[PDB]
């Protein structure tokens, strides 16, 4: 059985992790463009390379964690090291606006790469714990929703709380508040790591545990080929929408701070959909659930763009569209799990299949970031921090309505089967 203490600890750890990563995954490109003053192509290339490398370097840390064997175990020391190292790197990451000249770029690149590596170090053992720590059979289906609930909650809280803090502490210096926000994030991160370390214990240990094989496996499982292709498009679309929102709601729409309403508050609908999910699944067939998952985001985007003309930016429009998008994201995220086992049923060949999803996710995120960088650089000058020059609104609109094409492609690929 699983106690409540362990579930709470394993939810708090995930809360800390996502609470650390959200700000970097939302406000980084905006920070560089509108605060530091970097170019656009440089940011695009930096993000592309520094995310592809982090996507491809995951397996190595698996070998390192397998090899480590010492007094404290083989996961706790790595988690403890990663927490502090990543916290210090993150604090240093939001102070690039104190330099100037050639060294300014070098510092940016070095700090970003360090952040990626340290986060990977901190993250791998934390998720490697579950199969070993207290899991015999079917006791994981009860533990799994706990960490993901807090993982979803962290992003909403950060999105709803960020801007007011900087605004209160900012004024003529709009990074000095970012540094303090980073301090708060680090405090929460360290507290969560301490709690999980003190309230998680190890049981059910284990011992003793090619590219040609990979390509053979990919070719053999045609269903597996469709699974990864389906996942990639949705990941890219979601990354585009989540990343570019600040630019859209600062330039195209009147910058009256409807971004928190659009994301943070619809987070509540996300949480409700997640918490009531089993009854909804029992009520309805899986195919219709998948169709709704792929449909709702398109409705949100259609409402957004369609009402973007001849309106005063209806509040009901923004919140409703956000609710639709969050419902779709939560439903698709939960539905992803069931398909992998069915696909793979027909080295280990299951541990290998475990990492392919993460590979695809990170690759899609990097590709989306590069795409945004290039397209934004093409049309106009965003770093101006000035009134939106006309004829750039078309560029921003196409940027933010491109995801619907990826949603369409995912729907077609699924409908094929």
């Amino acid at each position, epitope marked *: 059985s699983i106690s409540m203490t362990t579930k709470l600890s394993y939810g708090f750890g995930a809360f800390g992790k996502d609470f650390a990563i959200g700000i970097v995954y939302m406000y980084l490109m905006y920070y560089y463009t509108d605060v530091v003053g970097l170019s656009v192509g440089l940011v695009g290339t930096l993000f592309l390379v520094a995310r592809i490398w982090d996507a491809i370097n995951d397996p190595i840390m698996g070998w390192i964690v397998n090899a480590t064997r010492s007094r404290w175990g083989k996961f706790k020391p790595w988690i403890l090291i990663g927490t502090l190292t990543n916290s210090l790197v993150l604090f240093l990451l939001f102070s690039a606006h104190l330099f100037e000249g050639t060294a300014q770029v070098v510092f940016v690149c070095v700090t970003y790469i360090l952040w990626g590596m340290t986060y990977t170090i901190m993250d791998i053992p934390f998720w490697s714990l579950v*199969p*070993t720590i207290t*899991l*015999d*059979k*079917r006791e994981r289906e009860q533990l799994v929703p706990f960490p993901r609930f807090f993982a979803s909650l962290a992003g909403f809280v950060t999105a709803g709380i960020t801007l007011p803090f900087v605004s209160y502490v900012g004024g003529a210096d709009r990074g000095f508040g970012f540094q303090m926000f980073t301090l708060v994030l680090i405090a929460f991160f360290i507290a969560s790591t301490i709690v999980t370390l003190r309230n998680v214990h190890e*049981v*059910y*240990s284990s011992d003793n545990g090619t590219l040609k094989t990979i390509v053979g496996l990919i070719y053999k499982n045609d269903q597996l080929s469709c699974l990864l292709g389906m996942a990639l498009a949705y990941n890219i679309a979601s990354n585009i929408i989540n990343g570019f929102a600040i630019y859209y709601f600062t330039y195209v729409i009147g910058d009256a701070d409807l971004f928190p309403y659009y994301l943070s508050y619809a987070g509540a609908a996300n949480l409700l959909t997640l918490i009531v999910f089993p009854r909804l699944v029992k009520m309805l067939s899986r195919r219709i659930l998948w169709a709704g998952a792929s449909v709702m985001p398109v409705l949100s985007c259609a409402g957004l763009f369609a009402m973007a003309l001849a309106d005063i930016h209806n509040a009901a429009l923004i919140v409703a569209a956000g609710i639709f998008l969050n419902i779709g994201t939560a439903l698709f995220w939960v539905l992803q799990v069931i398909m992998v086992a069915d696909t793979v049923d027909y080295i280990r060949c299951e541990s290998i299949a475990y990492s392919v999803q993460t590979m695809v996710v990170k690759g899609g995120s990097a590709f989306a970031a590069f795409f945004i960088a290039l397209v934004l650089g093409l049309i106009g000058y965003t770093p101006n921090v000035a009134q939106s020059a006309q004829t750039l609104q078309g560029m921003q609109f196409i940027m933010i309505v491109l995801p619907v094409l990826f949603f369409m492609m995912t729907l077609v690929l699924y409908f094929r089967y």
Partner: nanobody, 115 residues
Framework: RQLVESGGGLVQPGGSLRLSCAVS????????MGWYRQAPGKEREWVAT???????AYADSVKGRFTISRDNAKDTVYLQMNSLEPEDTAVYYC??????????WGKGTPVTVSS
């Protein structure tokens, strides 16, 4: 379902044995299967357990001597025993933890080691 246990016999001290707990009526990918041993004038005690993933836990007394393995192809669990001692003489049962409605113990097999 039903658990049928085999092996068993007489071995002098320092010998080795293998016990196979054939299972049926439940999809072999299922709750961990464990072993217990009971001796005259004593109660049942736990020996070892192996989960569906393949992670194994052992009792202190048998640590470093007994090993537990899971085989899905044969739908069986194997307990290898080495350096058996007179204190290790007992009847060994094949427990199927999980599914609290039915634990469904096995009859057990008697193994004795004497001079």
């Amino acid at each position: 379902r039903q658990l049928v246990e085999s092996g068993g016999g007489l071995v002098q001290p320092g010998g080795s044995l293998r016990l196979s707990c054939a299972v049926s009526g439940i999809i072999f990918r299922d709750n961990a299967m464990g072993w217990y041993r009971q001796a005259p004038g004593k109660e049942r005690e736990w020996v070892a357990t192996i989960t569906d993933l393949g992670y194994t836990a052992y009792a202190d007394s048998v640590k470093g001597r007994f090993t537990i393995s899971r085989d899905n192809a044969k739908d069986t669990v194997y307990l290898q025993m080495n350096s058996l001692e007179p204190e290790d003489t007992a009847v060994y049962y094949c427990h199927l933890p999980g599914t609290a409605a039915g634990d469904y113990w096995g009859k057990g097999t008697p193994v004795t080691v004497s001079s």
